[PDB]
Amino acid sequence: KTHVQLSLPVLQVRDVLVRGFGDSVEEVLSEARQHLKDGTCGLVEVEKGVLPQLEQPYVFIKRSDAAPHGHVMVELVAELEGIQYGRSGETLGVLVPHVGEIPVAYRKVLLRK
């Protein structure tokens, strides 16, 4: 299927134990997609102070359309040293590995795969 419905655990930034997916733009998009498929991907909502507490390259989910069954359609965009790889809409948050942290909420999305 070209899209998959997921419900992503929303994590507080200071609880995150593994603060990024890897060391290159290509690796972090790859690992983010793998973790989404395996159900081991969390979401950190971006506010002042958040991104400097996480590791670059970043992987964002961004809105890709103006929302079936409650799930916002999203796509992945990576960022490294101020340059983004991908072009999309408003950021819904930054993706990180989930390794058991307790979430504050869940965010329903329809992920373009």
From Swiss-Prot:
Changing K37R: In strain: Omicron/XBB.1.5, Omicron/EG.5.1. It is found in: Host cytoplasm. It comes from the Viruses. Residues 1-113 are annotated as: Disordered. Residues 2-113 form the CoV Nsp1 globular domain. Inhibits host translation by associating with the open head conformation of the 40S subunit. The C-terminus binds to and obstructs ribosomal mRNA entry tunnel. Thereby inhibits antiviral response triggered by innate immunity or interferons. The nsp1-40S ribosome complex further induces an endonucleolytic cleavage near the 5'UTR of host mRNAs, targeting them for degradation. This inhibits the integrated stress response (ISR) in the infected cell by preventing EIF2S1/eIF2-alpha phosphorylation upstream of stress granule formation and depletes host G3BP1. This is Host translation inhibitor nsp1. It comes from Severe acute respiratory syndrome coronavirus 2. The lineage of its organism: Viruses, Riboviria, Orthornavirae, Pisuviricota, Pisoniviricetes.
